[PDB]
């Protein structure tokens, strides 16, 4: 299949997601390291076989990732490795364009007062906002393939909505608190209760401070994913989805919800 779509056309997100899924054996929602040496090995092949020289990015993705055995890649890394959508990717990397933790700040803006996951009509609208960011307005071919990959590659329960791990899979794992935040999954139930704990005034609202008060649990819970150094930062990022410096938990829960859906 790769061999066909890899160097076939500018393939959409589910396709490139499939081609990459081909080697994405551990289905960890990310290409592995060896799988990368195994995938990237198929890339240079898709080129040699499909009669296309390997693009500096594929040949380099291979030169770069051909040794990322102790490394992993998200949807965005592979999204643009293959010529799936040089245009749709503009929003694809919109997560990594300036910041992994910052873009997410914008992800919740349209999320209807930030429900914790975008909607079908909202996310479908969200991609548009991506268009607003790319300053190009990625055509239907760019944003649709995207709109769908958002709710599909992350389909919590298949409602049509969007959670973070999709945006987190297409976002920059490099500094994203999410890739660690997923494993950081306390539990939507502990989220609700801890949050309530952070809700010291009993007002139903958590501010960017409680956020670090949230992380304090987290770092002590997993210094492997939550460092008390970046914890204040982990409080900062969830904050990115909060409301006017005061967070409505519907924004944080998504950061570390086990996947309550």
Please provide residue 226's backbone torsions phi and psi, each rounded to the nearest 5 degrees: -125, 95
- Asked whether residue 155 is marked as a ligand-binding residue, the answer is yes
175-261 topology per CATH: Recoverin; domain 1 (1.10.238)
Segments of the chain assigned to CATH 1.10.238.10: 1-71, 72-174, 175-261
Is 65 within 8 Å of 40 (Cβ atoms)?
yes
- Asked whether residue 227 is marked as a ligand-binding residue, the answer is no
72-174 topology per CATH: Recoverin; domain 1 (1.10.238)
- Asked whether residue 201 is marked as a ligand-binding residue, the answer is yes
- Asked whether residue 242 is marked as a ligand-binding residue, the answer is no
- Asked whether residue 148 is marked as a ligand-binding residue, the answer is no
- Asked whether residue 26 is marked as a ligand-binding residue, the answer is yes
Q: What is the CATH number of domain 1-71?
A: 1.10.238.10
- Asked whether residue 146 is marked as a ligand-binding residue, the answer is no
- Asked whether residue 207 is marked as a ligand-binding residue, the answer is no
User: In angstroms, rounded to a whole number, what is the distance separating the alpha carbons of residues 234 and 133?
Assistant: 24
- Asked whether residue 139 is marked as a ligand-binding residue, the answer is no
Please provide residue 73's backbone torsions phi and psi, each rounded to the nearest 5 degrees: -135, 145
Is 36 within 8 Å of 65 (Cβ atoms)?
yes
User: In angstroms, rounded to a whole number, what is the distance separating the alpha carbons of residues 104 and 234?
Assistant: 13
User: In angstroms, rounded to a whole number, what is the distance separating the alpha carbons of residues 189 and 257?
Assistant: 8
Please provide residue 12's backbone torsions phi and psi, each rounded to the nearest 5 degrees: -75, -175
Look at the block and give the residue holding tokens 């693009």.
55
DSSP letters spanning the chain: -HHHHTTTS---HHHHHHHHHHH-TT-SSSB-SHHHHHHHHHHHHHHHHTT-PPPHHHHHHHHHHTTGGG--B-HHHHHHHTTS-TTHHHHHGGGTSS-HHHHHHHHTTSSTTT-SSB-HHHHHHHHHHHHHHHTS---HHHHHHHHHHHHHTT-SSSSS-B-HHHHHHSS-TTT-SHHHHHHT---HHHHHHHHHHH--SSSS-EEHHHHHHHHHHHHHH-TTT--TTTHHHHHHHHHTTSBTTEE-GGGTHHHH--S--
- Asked whether residue 205 is marked as a ligand-binding residue, the answer is yes
- Asked whether residue 35 is marked as a ligand-binding residue, the answer is yes
- Residue 145, both tokens: 């393939």
Is 69 within 8 Å of 33 (Cβ atoms)?
yes
Is 222 within 8 Å of 228 (Cβ atoms)?
no
- Asked whether residue 101 is marked as a ligand-binding residue, the answer is no
> Which residues, including other chains, have CB under 8 Å from residue 199's CB and lie 6 or more apart?
205, 206, 210
Is 5 within 8 Å of 15 (Cβ atoms)?
yes
- Residue 148, both tokens: 């769908």
- Asked whether residue 166 is marked as a ligand-binding residue, the answer is yes
User: In angstroms, rounded to a whole number, what is the distance separating the alpha carbons of residues 210 and 172?
Assistant: 25
- Asked whether residue 217 is marked as a ligand-binding residue, the answer is no
Considering only CA atoms, give the Rg of the chain: 19
């Amino acid at each position: 299949m790769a061999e066909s779509h890899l160097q076939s056309s500018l393939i959409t997100a589910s396709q490139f997601f499939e081609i990459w899924l081909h080697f994405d054996a551990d289905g960890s929602g990310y290409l592995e390291g060896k799988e990368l040496q195994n995938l990237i090995q198929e890339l240079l092949q898709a080129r040699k076989k499909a009669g296309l020289e390997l693009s500096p990015e594929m040949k380099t993705f291979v030169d770069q990732y051909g040794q990322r055995d102790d490394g992993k890649i998200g949807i965005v890394e592979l999204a643009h490795v293959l010529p799936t959508e040089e245009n749709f990717l503009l929003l694809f990397r919109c997560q990594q364009l300036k910041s992994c933790e910052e873009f997410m700040k914008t992800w919740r803006k349209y999320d209807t007062d930030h429900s914790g996951f975008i909607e079908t009509e909202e996310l479908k609208n969200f991609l548009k906002d991506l268009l607003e960011k790319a300053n190009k307005t990625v055509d239907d071919t760019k944003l649709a393939e995207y709109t769908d990959l958002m709710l599909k590659l992350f389909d919590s329960n298949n409602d049509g909505k969007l959670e973070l791990t999709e945006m987190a899979r297409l976002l920059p794992v490099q500094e994203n608190f999410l890739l660690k935040f997923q494993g950081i999954k306390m539990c939507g139930k502990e989220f609700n209760k801890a949050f309530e704990l952070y809700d010291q005034d009993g007002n139903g609202y958590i501010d960017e401070n409680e956020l670090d008060a949230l992380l304090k649990d987290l770092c002590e819970k997993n210094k492997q994913e939550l460092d008390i150094n970046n914890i204040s930062t982990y409080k900062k990022n969830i904050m990115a989805l909060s409301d006017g410096g005061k967070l409505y938990r519907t924004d944080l829960a998504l950061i570390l919800s086990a996947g309550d859906n």
